[PDB]
Amino acid sequence: VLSPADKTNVKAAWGKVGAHAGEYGAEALERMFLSFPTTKTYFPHFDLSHGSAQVKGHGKKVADALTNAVAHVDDMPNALSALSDLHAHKLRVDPVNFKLLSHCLLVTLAAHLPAEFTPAVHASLDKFLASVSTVLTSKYR
C-alpha cells in the first residue's frame, strides 16, 4: 500500500518526468531488451533496433499508462483494469517480466533525474511500480 508520502514522492517524481515520459518509456524498453533478452520473446513482430520508431511509439504508450496510473493513484485497480485484462487475457506476459521492466524504469529515471532520484523517492517509485505490476497481473487466473 502506498502511503501519503509515497504518493507525494511519486506525483513529484513523475511531474518532473513531464514532457519526456515518451522518451523515457522508450529508453527503459531499450534497457530491458538489452539487459534481459528473454523479454524480446514478447516482441517478435517489432523492430528492436536502436532508434526503432516502433519502440519509441510503444514507449510513449507505456508512459501514458503510468502517467494515468499516477493520475489515479487512489484507484489504480480501476484506472488500469483495461490494461490488466489485456495483459492477462490476450498477451499473457509472464509475471516475472513486470519486475524487469520496473527495474529498467527506475534505472532510466535515475539516469535522468539526478536531483530528485533520492533514496526516499527511489523507495516510493519502487513501491509504485510494484503496485502497478500487481494490478496488471491480478487477473492472470
Binding site: 533478452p37 528473454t38 520473446t41 514478447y42 517478435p44 492477462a88 498477451l91 499473457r92 506476459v93 509472464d94 516475472v96 517480466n97 492472470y140 487466473r141
Partner: protein, 146 residues
C-alpha cells in the same frame, strides 16, 4: 548440475519407473491449467477452456510425450545439459519465441506430477535431486536465448 552420485543414482533410479506417456501428458497438461498464460503457445491445440478440455486434449498429451522424451534424454548426459539442449534452446527462442521462465514453471509442475504418482517413494531427498535436475534443464534450455 552438481549431482551427488547418490543423486544421479536416485534420479536415474526413479525415472526408470516413469511412464513417460502419461507423466509427459499430465505435466504439460497441468501446466496449461495452473498457469493459464502458458496456453498462449498452444491455441492451435484447440479447446483448452477447461481442465478436462486440456487434460484429455490429445494434442497436449502428444506434445507432453515429446517434451518428456527430450527431457528424458538429457538425463543420459547429466554432465552436459547445455550441449544436449543447445538446438532446442535456439528453436524455442528464435522460432517459438518461448519465454524461458516457462521452462522453470514446467519443472515445478513436473516435480508435482512425480510426487503425485510416486507418493511415499518421492522422498525429500529425492525431490531435492530432481529439483536440481529441473533447474539444470531450465537453464540448459534458456542458455542460447539472445
Amino acid at each position: 548440475v552438481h549431482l551427488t552420485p547418490e543423486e544421479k543414482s536416485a534420479v536415474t533410479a526413479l525415472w526408470g519407473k516413469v511412464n513417460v506417456d502419461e507423466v509427459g501428458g499430465e505435466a504439460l497438461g497441468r501446466l496449461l491449467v495452473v498457469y493459464p498464460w502458458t496456453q498462449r503457445f498452444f491455441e492451435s491445440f484447440g479447446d483448452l477452456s477447461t481442465p478436462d478440455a486440456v487434460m484429455g486434449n490429445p494434442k497436449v498429451k502428444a506434445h507432453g510425450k515429446k517434451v518428456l522424451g527430450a527431457f528424458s534424454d538429457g538425463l543420459a548426459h547429466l554432465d552436459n545439459l547445455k550441449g544436449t539442449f543447445a538446438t532446442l534452446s535456439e528453436l524455442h527462442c528464435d522460432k517459438l519465441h518461448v519465454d524461458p521462465e516457462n521452462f522453470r514453471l514446467l519443472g515445478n509442475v513436473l516435480v508435482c506430477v512425480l510426487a503425485h504418482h510416486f507418493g511415499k517413494e518421492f522422498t525429500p531427498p529425492v525431490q531435492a535431486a530432481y529439483q536440481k535436475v529441473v533447474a539444470g534443464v531450465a537453464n540448459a534450455l534458456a542458455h542460447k536465448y539472445h
